[PDB]
mmCIF file of C-alpha atoms and ligand atoms in Angstrom:
data_model
loop_
_atom_site.group_PDB
_atom_site.id
_atom_site.type_symbol
_atom_site.label_atom_id
_atom_site.label_comp_id
_atom_site.label_asym_id
_atom_site.label_seq_id
_atom_site.Cartn_x
_atom_site.Cartn_y
_atom_site.Cartn_z
ATOM 1 C CA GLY A 1 0.006 -0.002 -0.003
ATOM 2 C CA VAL A 2 0.928 3.667 0.134
ATOM 3 C CA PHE A 3 1.749 5.716 3.249
ATOM 4 C CA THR A 4 1.692 9.478 2.769
ATOM 5 C CA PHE A 5 2.699 12.385 5.015
ATOM 6 C CA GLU A 6 3.863 15.957 4.888
ATOM 7 C CA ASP A 7 6.641 17.952 6.538
ATOM 8 C CA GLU A 8 7.938 21.524 6.342
ATOM 9 C CA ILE A 9 11.246 23.299 6.701
ATOM 10 C CA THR A 10 12.303 26.989 6.602
ATOM 11 C CA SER A 11 15.130 28.970 5.098
ATOM 12 C CA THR A 12 16.361 32.561 5.065
ATOM 13 C CA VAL A 13 17.244 32.061 1.380
ATOM 14 C CA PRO A 14 14.578 33.126 -1.120
ATOM 15 C CA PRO A 15 12.933 30.349 -3.163
ATOM 16 C CA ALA A 16 14.069 31.245 -6.724
ATOM 17 C CA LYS A 17 17.691 31.239 -5.466
ATOM 18 C CA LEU A 18 17.269 28.066 -3.462
ATOM 19 C CA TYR A 19 15.570 26.319 -6.364
ATOM 20 C CA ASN A 20 18.395 27.191 -8.752
ATOM 21 C CA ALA A 21 20.841 25.905 -6.163
ATOM 22 C CA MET A 22 18.891 22.601 -5.902
ATOM 23 C CA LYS A 23 19.552 21.953 -9.618
ATOM 24 C CA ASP A 24 23.272 21.904 -8.854
ATOM 25 C CA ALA A 25 22.887 19.446 -5.944
ATOM 26 C CA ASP A 26 24.802 16.780 -7.864
ATOM 27 C CA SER A 27 27.954 18.998 -7.730
ATOM 28 C CA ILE A 28 27.364 20.651 -4.333
ATOM 29 C CA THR A 29 26.399 17.710 -2.191
ATOM 30 C CA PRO A 30 29.651 15.714 -2.462
ATOM 31 C CA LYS A 31 31.713 18.725 -1.321
ATOM 32 C CA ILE A 32 29.697 19.573 1.789
ATOM 33 C CA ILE A 33 28.477 16.205 3.040
ATOM 34 C CA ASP A 34 31.319 14.015 4.228
ATOM 35 C CA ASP A 35 29.611 10.684 3.409
ATOM 36 C CA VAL A 36 28.539 11.572 -0.150
ATOM 37 C CA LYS A 37 31.394 10.914 -2.600
ATOM 38 C CA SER A 38 29.735 11.314 -5.965
ATOM 39 C CA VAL A 39 26.470 11.606 -7.782
ATOM 40 C CA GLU A 40 26.484 10.246 -11.340
ATOM 41 C CA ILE A 41 23.875 9.984 -14.020
ATOM 42 C CA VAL A 42 23.386 6.360 -15.061
ATOM 43 C CA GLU A 43 20.934 7.188 -17.861
ATOM 44 C CA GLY A 44 18.912 10.181 -19.083
ATOM 45 C CA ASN A 45 19.306 13.969 -19.656
ATOM 46 C CA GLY A 46 18.473 15.102 -16.062
ATOM 47 C CA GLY A 47 14.734 15.421 -16.726
ATOM 48 C CA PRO A 48 11.924 12.940 -15.901
ATOM 49 C CA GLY A 49 12.948 9.279 -15.969
ATOM 50 C CA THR A 50 16.619 10.027 -15.379
ATOM 51 C CA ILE A 51 18.280 7.484 -13.105
ATOM 52 C CA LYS A 52 21.064 8.563 -10.758
ATOM 53 C CA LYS A 53 23.505 6.617 -8.663
ATOM 54 C CA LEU A 54 24.717 8.144 -5.385
ATOM 55 C CA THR A 55 27.855 6.753 -3.895
ATOM 56 C CA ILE A 56 28.357 7.082 -0.143
ATOM 57 C CA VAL A 57 30.483 5.609 2.654
ATOM 58 C CA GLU A 58 29.138 4.699 6.126
ATOM 59 C CA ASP A 59 31.421 3.069 8.700
ATOM 60 C CA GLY A 60 34.110 2.413 6.067
ATOM 61 C CA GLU A 61 31.928 0.536 3.569
ATOM 62 C CA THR A 62 31.115 1.999 0.163
ATOM 63 C CA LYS A 63 27.380 1.765 -0.641
ATOM 64 C CA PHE A 64 25.123 3.045 -3.406
ATOM 65 C CA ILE A 65 21.654 4.575 -3.769
ATOM 66 C CA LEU A 66 19.431 4.882 -6.846
ATOM 67 C CA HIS A 67 17.216 7.838 -7.495
ATOM 68 C CA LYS A 68 14.768 8.342 -10.308
ATOM 69 C CA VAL A 69 13.616 11.776 -11.314
ATOM 70 C CA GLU A 70 9.793 11.871 -11.413
ATOM 71 C CA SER A 71 8.965 15.426 -12.530
ATOM 72 C CA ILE A 72 10.126 19.010 -12.655
ATOM 73 C CA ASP A 73 8.136 22.251 -12.684
ATOM 74 C CA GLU A 74 10.518 25.230 -12.589
ATOM 75 C CA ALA A 75 7.658 27.811 -12.524
ATOM 76 C CA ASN A 76 6.416 26.367 -9.221
ATOM 77 C CA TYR A 77 9.845 25.614 -7.681
ATOM 78 C CA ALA A 78 9.065 21.876 -7.654
ATOM 79 C CA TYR A 79 11.145 18.709 -8.018
ATOM 80 C CA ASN A 80 9.931 15.151 -7.404
ATOM 81 C CA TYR A 81 12.201 12.156 -7.209
ATOM 82 C CA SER A 82 12.098 8.612 -5.868
ATOM 83 C CA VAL A 83 14.438 6.189 -4.218
ATOM 84 C CA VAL A 84 14.204 3.051 -6.389
ATOM 85 C CA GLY A 85 17.185 1.024 -5.199
ATOM 86 C CA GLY A 86 20.259 0.658 -3.034
ATOM 87 C CA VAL A 87 20.675 0.807 0.749
ATOM 88 C CA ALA A 88 18.098 3.567 1.188
ATOM 89 C CA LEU A 89 15.335 1.303 -0.223
ATOM 90 C CA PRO A 90 14.374 -1.305 2.386
ATOM 91 C CA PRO A 91 13.538 -4.826 1.098
ATOM 92 C CA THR A 92 9.868 -4.507 2.203
ATOM 93 C CA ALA A 93 9.409 -1.250 0.247
ATOM 94 C CA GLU A 94 8.710 -0.952 -3.477
ATOM 95 C CA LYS A 95 9.645 2.717 -3.730
ATOM 96 C CA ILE A 96 9.845 5.949 -1.721
ATOM 97 C CA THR A 97 8.842 9.195 -3.384
ATOM 98 C CA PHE A 98 9.851 12.706 -2.312
ATOM 99 C CA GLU A 99 7.665 15.448 -3.733
ATOM 100 C CA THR A 100 9.219 18.853 -3.029
ATOM 101 C CA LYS A 101 7.941 22.378 -3.354
ATOM 102 C CA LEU A 102 9.345 25.758 -2.406
ATOM 103 C CA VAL A 103 7.192 28.750 -1.557
ATOM 104 C CA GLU A 104 7.814 32.354 -0.468
ATOM 105 C CA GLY A 105 8.308 32.420 3.238
ATOM 106 C CA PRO A 106 7.842 35.402 5.485
ATOM 107 C CA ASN A 107 10.768 37.816 5.838
ATOM 108 C CA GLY A 108 12.106 37.169 2.283
ATOM 109 C CA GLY A 109 12.989 33.509 2.980
ATOM 110 C CA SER A 110 11.522 30.189 1.861
ATOM 111 C CA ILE A 111 9.214 27.518 3.123
ATOM 112 C CA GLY A 112 10.023 24.082 1.770
ATOM 113 C CA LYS A 113 7.225 21.545 1.655
ATOM 114 C CA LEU A 114 7.815 17.828 1.376
ATOM 115 C CA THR A 115 5.223 15.119 0.670
ATOM 116 C CA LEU A 116 6.629 11.652 1.284
ATOM 117 C CA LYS A 117 4.943 8.611 -0.330
ATOM 118 C CA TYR A 118 6.184 5.300 0.904
ATOM 119 C CA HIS A 119 4.998 2.414 -1.318
ATOM 120 C CA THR A 120 5.062 -1.043 0.253
ATOM 121 C CA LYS A 121 5.077 -4.552 -1.142
ATOM 122 C CA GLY A 122 1.905 -6.432 -0.104
ATOM 123 C CA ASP A 123 0.808 -6.146 3.567
ATOM 124 C CA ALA A 124 4.191 -4.876 4.757
ATOM 125 C CA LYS A 125 4.209 -1.788 6.952
ATOM 126 C CA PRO A 126 6.645 1.163 6.627
ATOM 127 C CA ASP A 127 9.892 0.835 8.545
ATOM 128 C CA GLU A 128 10.030 3.390 11.372
ATOM 129 C CA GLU A 129 13.806 3.227 11.929
ATOM 130 C CA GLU A 130 14.455 3.834 8.202
ATOM 131 C CA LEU A 131 11.990 6.713 8.236
ATOM 132 C CA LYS A 132 13.659 8.402 11.234
ATOM 133 C CA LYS A 133 17.065 7.948 9.594
ATOM 134 C CA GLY A 134 15.652 9.306 6.334
ATOM 135 C CA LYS A 135 14.370 12.551 7.923
ATOM 136 C CA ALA A 136 17.788 13.292 9.373
ATOM 137 C CA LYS A 137 19.375 12.732 5.921
ATOM 138 C CA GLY A 138 16.808 14.886 4.156
ATOM 139 C CA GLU A 139 17.257 17.707 6.660
ATOM 140 C CA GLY A 140 21.015 17.479 6.159
ATOM 141 C CA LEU A 141 20.623 17.723 2.420
ATOM 142 C CA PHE A 142 18.457 20.814 2.655
ATOM 143 C CA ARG A 143 20.821 22.531 5.087
ATOM 144 C CA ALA A 144 23.798 21.645 2.911
ATOM 145 C CA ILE A 145 22.289 23.275 -0.177
ATOM 146 C CA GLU A 146 21.169 26.286 1.884
ATOM 147 C CA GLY A 147 24.617 26.404 3.527
ATOM 148 C CA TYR A 148 26.294 26.521 0.154
ATOM 149 C CA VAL A 149 24.118 29.406 -1.037
ATOM 150 C CA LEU A 150 24.687 31.349 2.164
ATOM 151 C CA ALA A 151 28.440 30.758 2.036
ATOM 152 C CA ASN A 152 28.691 31.759 -1.653
ATOM 153 C CA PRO A 153 26.388 34.856 -1.914
ATOM 154 C CA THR A 154 27.706 36.008 -5.381
ATOM 155 C CA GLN A 155 26.635 32.740 -7.033
ATOM 156 C CA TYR A 156 22.803 32.565 -7.569
HETATM 157 O O1 QUE B 1 19.337 8.758 0.926
HETATM 158 C C1 QUE B 1 20.248 9.618 0.898
HETATM 159 C C2 QUE B 1 20.185 10.773 -0.014
HETATM 160 O O2 QUE B 1 19.084 10.825 -0.808
HETATM 161 C C3 QUE B 1 21.244 11.832 0.036
HETATM 162 C C4 QUE B 1 21.231 12.855 -1.028
HETATM 163 C C5 QUE B 1 22.501 13.182 -1.502
HETATM 164 C C6 QUE B 1 22.706 14.004 -2.606
HETATM 165 C C7 QUE B 1 21.652 14.485 -3.348
HETATM 166 O O3 QUE B 1 21.908 15.286 -4.416
HETATM 167 C C8 QUE B 1 20.284 14.082 -2.933
HETATM 168 O O4 QUE B 1 19.182 14.517 -3.616
HETATM 169 C C9 QUE B 1 20.135 13.251 -1.823
HETATM 170 O O5 QUE B 1 22.348 11.613 0.840
HETATM 171 C C10 QUE B 1 22.457 10.559 1.712
HETATM 172 C C11 QUE B 1 23.551 10.411 2.570
HETATM 173 C C12 QUE B 1 23.640 9.322 3.457
HETATM 174 O O6 QUE B 1 24.714 9.200 4.282
HETATM 175 C C13 QUE B 1 22.655 8.318 3.529
HETATM 176 C C14 QUE B 1 21.530 8.368 2.726
HETATM 177 O O7 QUE B 1 20.576 7.386 2.835
HETATM 178 C C15 QUE B 1 21.405 9.506 1.781
HETATM 179 O O1 QUE B 2 10.491 20.463 1.934
HETATM 180 C C1 QUE B 2 11.587 19.901 1.819
HETATM 181 C C2 QUE B 2 12.294 19.888 0.545
HETATM 182 O O2 QUE B 2 11.675 20.531 -0.471
HETATM 183 C C3 QUE B 2 13.627 19.211 0.449
HETATM 184 C C4 QUE B 2 14.328 19.129 -0.891
HETATM 185 C C5 QUE B 2 15.223 18.060 -1.098
HETATM 186 C C6 QUE B 2 15.879 17.870 -2.321
HETATM 187 C C7 QUE B 2 15.643 18.736 -3.402
HETATM 188 O O3 QUE B 2 16.282 18.573 -4.607
HETATM 189 C C8 QUE B 2 14.687 19.845 -3.226
HETATM 190 O O4 QUE B 2 14.460 20.694 -4.280
HETATM 191 C C9 QUE B 2 14.054 20.005 -1.990
HETATM 192 O O5 QUE B 2 14.119 18.573 1.596
HETATM 193 C C10 QUE B 2 13.472 18.564 2.833
HETATM 194 C C11 QUE B 2 13.966 17.957 3.986
HETATM 195 C C12 QUE B 2 13.259 17.992 5.213
HETATM 196 O O6 QUE B 2 13.769 17.382 6.319
HETATM 197 C C13 QUE B 2 12.024 18.624 5.359
HETATM 198 C C14 QUE B 2 11.467 19.251 4.261
HETATM 199 O O7 QUE B 2 10.271 19.897 4.312
HETATM 200 C C15 QUE B 2 12.180 19.235 2.971
HETATM 201 O O1 QUE B 3 12.009 9.281 5.706
HETATM 202 C C1 QUE B 3 12.375 10.387 5.276
HETATM 203 C C2 QUE B 3 13.391 10.490 4.209
HETATM 204 O O2 QUE B 3 13.923 9.347 3.702
HETATM 205 C C3 QUE B 3 13.770 11.862 3.744
HETATM 206 C C4 QUE B 3 14.788 12.130 2.720
HETATM 207 C C5 QUE B 3 14.844 13.394 2.102
HETATM 208 C C6 QUE B 3 15.826 13.699 1.174
HETATM 209 C C7 QUE B 3 16.775 12.740 0.863
HETATM 210 O O3 QUE B 3 17.730 13.012 -0.043
HETATM 211 C C8 QUE B 3 16.715 11.418 1.516
HETATM 212 O O4 QUE B 3 17.591 10.440 1.260
HETATM 213 C C9 QUE B 3 15.743 11.160 2.435
HETATM 214 O O5 QUE B 3 13.220 12.976 4.290
HETATM 215 C C10 QUE B 3 12.283 12.938 5.250
HETATM 216 C C11 QUE B 3 11.788 14.127 5.732
HETATM 217 C C12 QUE B 3 10.835 14.113 6.728
HETATM 218 O O6 QUE B 3 10.391 15.327 7.138
HETATM 219 C C13 QUE B 3 10.343 12.928 7.294
HETATM 220 C C14 QUE B 3 10.793 11.683 6.864
HETATM 221 O O7 QUE B 3 10.355 10.518 7.402
HETATM 222 C C15 QUE B 3 11.817 11.647 5.804
HETATM 223 NA NA1 NA B 4 32.485 14.373 0.539
#
């Protein structure tokens, strides 16, 4: 079945800037986040259907994660992608989708909105430990992209 929920996060960076920065996440993320070593395109032109392989290291072991780009709407500061393989997909789960939107926040910042859709195989229930771990990783990612923009004000 599908399990859906929604979370929010804030930034002092305005949404057009932050959105443009999110497009360069493949190049930014490896620099800032210790564990992420590379992000490579396995197939596609970056738009919908593109498959990406993320290489990380946790506790000395090199692991990989597979993302698929679902859709892109630049007018509405929106990017949707799914985890479709690797360590971040648990064996009980078919797929985990992240639907992301940025909106104008108060005080010239941004509000980021995430809808998370966790698709399970059969009667299996979503893994709470993997969810908790996921939220921490997603937060980190957002802060890293924000951090880059704040630390490099001339770019964007
Ligand atoms: O699941 C993960 C993930 O998605 C990201 C991430 C990295 C770069 C990107 O450009 C992006 O969109 C996401 O980092 C991670 C780092 C970890 O140590 C463990 C994970 O499980 C993830
Ligand atoms: O709302 C959110 C959001 O949009 C993003 C995000 C991630 C990758 C992208 O490429 C992107 O454009 C946005 O991460 C988040 C992480 C959280 O812990 C909570 C959130 O609310 C978001
Ligand atoms: O379970 C979650 C999860 O996996 C991710 C996530 C986001 C971006 C990534 O690049 C990533 O690998 C994971 O965010 C979350 C954000 C929440 O607010 C709550 C969650 O439960 C998750
Ligand atoms: Na790194």
